[PDB]
Amino acid sequence: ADIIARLREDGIQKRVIQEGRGELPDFQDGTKATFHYRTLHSDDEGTVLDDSRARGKPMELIIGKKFKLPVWETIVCTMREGEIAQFLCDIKHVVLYPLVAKSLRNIAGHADLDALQQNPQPLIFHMEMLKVESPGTYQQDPWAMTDEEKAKAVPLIHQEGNRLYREGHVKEAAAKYYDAIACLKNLQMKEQPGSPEWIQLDQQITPLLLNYCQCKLVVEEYYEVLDHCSSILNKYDDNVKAYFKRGKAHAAVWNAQEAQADFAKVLELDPALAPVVSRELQALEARIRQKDEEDKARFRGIFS
Amino acid sequence: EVETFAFQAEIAQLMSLIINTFYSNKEIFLRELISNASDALDKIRYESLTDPSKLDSGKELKIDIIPNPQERTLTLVDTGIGMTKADLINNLGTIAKSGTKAFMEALQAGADISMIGQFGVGFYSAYLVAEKVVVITKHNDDEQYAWESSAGGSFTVRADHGEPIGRGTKVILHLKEDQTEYLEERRVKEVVKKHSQFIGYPITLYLEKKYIDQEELNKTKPIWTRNPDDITQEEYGEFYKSLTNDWEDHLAVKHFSVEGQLEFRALLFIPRRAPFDLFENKKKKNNIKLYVRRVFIMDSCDELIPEYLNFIRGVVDSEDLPLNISREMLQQSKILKVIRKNIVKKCLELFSELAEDKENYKKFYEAFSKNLKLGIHEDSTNRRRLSELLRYHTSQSGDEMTSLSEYVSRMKETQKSIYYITGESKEQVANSAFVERVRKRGFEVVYMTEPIDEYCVQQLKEFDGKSLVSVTKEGLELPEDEEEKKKMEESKAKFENLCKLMKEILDKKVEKVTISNRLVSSPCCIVTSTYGWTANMERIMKAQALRDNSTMGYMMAKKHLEINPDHPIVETLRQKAEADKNDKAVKDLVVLLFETALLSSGFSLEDPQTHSNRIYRMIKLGLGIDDEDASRMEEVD
Amino acid sequence: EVETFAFQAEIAQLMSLIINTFYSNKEIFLRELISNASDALDKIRYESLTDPSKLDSGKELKIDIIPNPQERTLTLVDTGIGMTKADLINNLGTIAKSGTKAFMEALQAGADISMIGQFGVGFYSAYLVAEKVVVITKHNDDEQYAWESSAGGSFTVRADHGEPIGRGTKVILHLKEDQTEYLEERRVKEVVKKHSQFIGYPITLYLEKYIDQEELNKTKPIWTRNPDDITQEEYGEFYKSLTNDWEDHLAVKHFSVEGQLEFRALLFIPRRAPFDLFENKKKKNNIKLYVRRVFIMDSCDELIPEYLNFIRGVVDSEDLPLNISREMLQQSKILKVIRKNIVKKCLELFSELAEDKENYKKFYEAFSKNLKLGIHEDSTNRRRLSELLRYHTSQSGDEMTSLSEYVSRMKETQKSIYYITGESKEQVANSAFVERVRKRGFEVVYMTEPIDEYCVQQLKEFDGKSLVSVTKEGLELPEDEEEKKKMEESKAKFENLCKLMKEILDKKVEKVTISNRLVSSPCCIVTSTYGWTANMERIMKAQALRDNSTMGYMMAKKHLEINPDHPIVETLRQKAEADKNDKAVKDLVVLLFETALLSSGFSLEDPQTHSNRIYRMIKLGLGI
Amino acid sequence: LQPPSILEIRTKNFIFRTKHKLDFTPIGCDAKGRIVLGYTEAELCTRGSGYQFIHAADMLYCAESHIRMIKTGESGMIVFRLLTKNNRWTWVQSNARLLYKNGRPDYIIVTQRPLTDEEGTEHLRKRNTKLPFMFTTGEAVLYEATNPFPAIMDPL
């Protein structure tokens, strides 16, 4: 209706510098608005404590799931696409400022944003919007998705990560697998343990965890692979791939006995593929013999 | 109408109750008879004080014990005041009638006389062992009569025509067939020594050895009745030797009195050496005994003094303490807590006073340092005063020990805490890796090399307002400069990757890997978390026979590995890890260093053979002794 | 002439003695009154057996307690037989006069009646807490009278006309100003629970909360029933009520003793050991003594030895003579006979439980420490206890086995039981002392607790066969003539190396000899036959209260046993023959000695020397 | 020379056991437990579903430990705060075991030790804050931070 008339009575006074383009958006429960911000102290000292457009770091914003701070949502409500404006805010709204800028900039003891902890006062806010889209057009990120839709979106992330791995990229594939694993694990919390649904959720995470282990192994990060393979084995103790990956990781970090035991379990569980395990054992033995020869050199006349 | 009656008593069952349900130990019959004889002697002495003519039938006040094995009789003879016929019939024929009590009431005020006996039933204990009792008495203004009875409901009184006793009384007990043991010399000596040791008259014993050898049983006087300022240390020592049967004198003595609603006197001694069975559990605590009017009542039994002060020998004597019908325990036993408070206060005062004489306190501490630390572990009210008695070796002290007060006086201006290390021995703690930086900076470290020391520091959180800090625990804070802080930050930044790698290698062996602030020459060390047992405490706890293994998980601390940035080995390790993190040499060296630090920090390996095998392998090395499905298996799904 | 007199009594002083010197605890007044009420109920119940018309003034036999904080009075109402005017005067006005005793002595023989009270002085304990006492009573063949007194030398009897009572007695106590704690619910409950828990009639407390009536003794004393007519469910319910434990019991033993000393006992074994089992600060109240279902005293370590402190149970008698306070047993020596019987039956129960493998598994897991403590402390039953021991073995795998099973598997040529004491199972299993012994097929017992070390000091043999430690010198193993000749050859070959090593380690050891128990290790340390072992020395050094100022005279000597078959030892012999004064041999010998010492359970007087040796070797290896 | 005897200081502990329902309903406890957590037996069993006794900050911690116990059959040592009758918060160090009647869990036995405020605060400070498989920096604590809570806590 008239949201500026509501804002002015709400206690926030604003001014428009350059009006935006298009039409006012609905901004219903769940809407993304990518925009820049530049906060500078109104009158206490006049400096700039935080900045987003100064160094080119837009602030991705979803409009109103909870967003404990109400001020930013209302601020972004009264603008359209491609609009820039500046304004102040009363102390009653940003009285919890230290809980916002504590890590939003570091993650990517501040002496600038903490001035309000001792002297709260009006604070200017320079917003600059670029795009504003409702859910359904942009790709929703996993944390803010609903369980019903994520239960169907999980396979897409799996296939995307698989394609990325085959195409020759592992870090991005590792991240995709990590996100899919996080989505699946979070879902398990909704069901009771041991129930058939819990097991069903647990069956489709094993392939993703195995893929993540394989991706980590290619990156030369073996202790994480050991941890994850051990976690799989403690519950299944029948996965040939898990045992193979665990043995390979053990051999990488010079865990000879455990690697040999894991490969032996692989053989006695799925004897079909002997030659691969034999080649792995022989390579490990050659490496161990070379290192033993080298040590024989180090340890020579150590006493005489 | 309303009828009124007077209370009655049925005599036969009353006598049965007195003989069967009052006294549990039969030997106390001799105590009661000796008490009666002493009361009679007190009466005659008091009467003769003002009328010397009363002591014309005999001037010596004494008691005799005369066993007669042939007749199976025991005779107790005293030269006291005696009884008249009316006195015989009233005092000895009436139950719960006390002539001593009436004598006391008939007396004036402020009389220097204190007599045992106010119940009027003690005499009938003679029927615990005697089938028949005969009493021959002779008062000054009366004739010599004989009193006889078998506790059968009646007694006979008749004039006695026998050996004229000058004055006093004579009790003859005709012992039962099964109570003949009381005619033996050793049994009588034991009973008299236990119960009537401080009687104010010579208890003589007559035996046939032919001739009648006399064995006097009252040699030692109750010296505690005298004023403390009129007793020399020689008499104190003689009394202590008699009391404890010790060939050497006492170390210290505390003689004090208490006045008021609760009044008593006490005499407490400190032995020169600890007895070999001091802490043995099956050791009756008769170290302190309670007397009422110089008659033994009960032993300490951990009620007159705390368990950790059991090495103190002494006597507690009172005049007005309400006893139960048997004279071997108090009525309203809550009184024992007040006496305990007074005794503990005075013992602590004695300990504090002895600390001024250095050699004597050296001997005392060598003897009973364990007891002070046990008290600190156990007693919280006196914890502050006990902590001032502790003496320790320090890094800055020679062969002589020092107190925590001397340590606090010598503290540096920037120092805020007392530093201590607990270990197996002085040599082990002095040369350990935990005290390198602390000793190099000039600070002082207290050495605690006894298993009991670990129990004490668990309760001594602070002293003189300064907290005690262990150098084998994590988070050791030392005063420093800004340059030291910047250098430590530089080292932390430089060695972060190595610490991460070592933590990865030793995942479950330790909880954290960090940069040390206390190492100089060693490459690393292992410290425990602030809460939980230290290495030494864990070692001591795991060696306890009566320990519950199911609860060690709740008490053990976690291990942190601290590495020394300035050591060549750590620098080479950092270089190698930067070059190649998966180097086998680095992993082997990390494991070996962790094992060495674990063994050098007071811990024990879960399997020492692994360390032994590593060493043997090093020695041998030194001596020169010795298809298409492959891709399909590890590609996707 | 000879005069004759009767014995008299001074009434006032007798009353003073009764009120001031007989009982040291003021709370026992309620016990006495409840005992009197139970006796009266017993008397009325017995009379009605042969004449049911007696129970016409009321059929229910009960006891009621009614505090009155406003009036400051405590009332005990019982529905017993009551007493007449003459009975009032004679019984309640005469000191040491017992109507209960006369009632017993009037009966016939073989009467199913057992009543407390035989001294005739208990009632006067009411004046411990009461200024004035009023007793309203009503016998069947008499009127309702009121008896009053202040224990001041006289008492008044009047005909009472207030609210009638059908039958029984009513004792009204007018409490003193300083004794009002007994008008509180908590105190009354605590006292009745402590003293009159197992009285044979209901005890109800009335309080103003409408009035709230609550029974206080809801558990029957089941130990009086026949042991063979009790199920496990009610045994468990009684155990839970007695111990206040949320779990059931593991085993029970119910038995009786007949003769001059007669008592019944009900002993329980808990399922789990309490966490404060050996805590010093706790009263030995695990077993309680009762006489005619009235509590007398606690165990106090007289009814049962210390190592059986986990047993919970009850001991009840009928004819134990008590002292006037009824808080101890005149000629208490009786409790040494009772203790003998209890120990006998507890061992019997332990033996019976062993037949059930899993229940005995739980029992051993819980209280195996107690059995070893008993073996150490007790010598009369040492043989019986040793048959209850269970150990891990080199051949038993995970499960534990007994010594009889060990003897059953004993080889024909074997003559001794082999054991090792160490810190843990892993340390002993992989020890160098058990290498050859396990290679030859012999069996070794694993003992990994300090209490085991204390236990083996008293258990010298079992079933005729001695126990031999594998960590002590002079280990004798069966062999063949080839073994003798080979050992002699090895000794002759290494005679020089042993001398050189003993020279290098002067005063650190006493002997260097060829080992007969090593296979893979190059050397080991063994202790002499006289003195403490390594584990024993470890356990003795950790006693805070023990005086270790003389332990130098109790520690054993250590002998270094080398393995002739090891490559390191052969190289050492070759190097020594080539040159005795070499430094390499000296350093290698010292390092070997330190490693063996650390591997044998000892601790170095200065671990930093070993650490510095290792650090120097590491630096040489790295090239620094 | 004193022969080897069994002289011991005999320290005193405060560990106590308790019995719980599968939702962690306290049904049965030691006397020491009552003296620590002042609660009548009648009240304790008739109070709540177990998680009503836990401090809010530790709720997710205890839920994770509960899931760990259900999976492995026992949750390792954990430290958290209990709500006493006095509406107080005391730190406890607990280990919970799961018992199976016949192939199925029946009840939980918990062994716990009381802690002082300093030790409990130190343990809380060292508590892990990063889950193994969280959803990276999605500002979940900022945007929504409102999860339905795990189902393990749901009644029955």
Ligand SMILES: Nc1ncnc2c1ncn2[C@@H]1O[C@H](COP(=O)(O)OP(=O)(O)O)[C@@H](O)[C@H]1O
């Ligand atoms: N040897 C004695 N000489 C004089 N009087 C005695 C002697 N023995 C007993 N009596 C008198 O006989 C009484 C016996 O009572 P007893 O049980 O001894 O009471 P008490 O507690 O006063 O000693 C005493 O009061 C005492 O006066």
Ligand SMILES: Nc1ncnc2c1ncn2[C@@H]1O[C@H](COP(=O)(O)OP(=O)(O)O)[C@@H](O)[C@H]1O
């Ligand atoms: N509640 C009662 N009902 C009937 N008789 C009682 C009651 N209380 C006491 N008596 C009588 O008074 C006598 C004295 O009791 P008491 O002095 O307590 O010891 P005892 O029970 O040994 O006699 C008893 O023998 C009993 O006959």
Ligand SMILES: c1ccc2c(c1)cc1ccc3cccc4ccc2c1c34
């Ligand atoms: C009184 C009341 C509640 C709990 C309690 C005691 C003890 C617990 C010990 C471990 C534990 C582990 C996971 C979840 C829990 C939830 C509730 C409780 C406990 C939990």
Ligand code: MOO
């Ligand atoms: O002599 Mo007494 O009767 O024990 O006071």
Ligand code: MOO
């Ligand atoms: O009721 Mo009594 O007088 O204690 O036997």
Ligand SMILES: [Mg+2]
């Ligand atoms: Mg007397």
Ligand SMILES: [Mg+2]
């Ligand atoms: Mg009675």
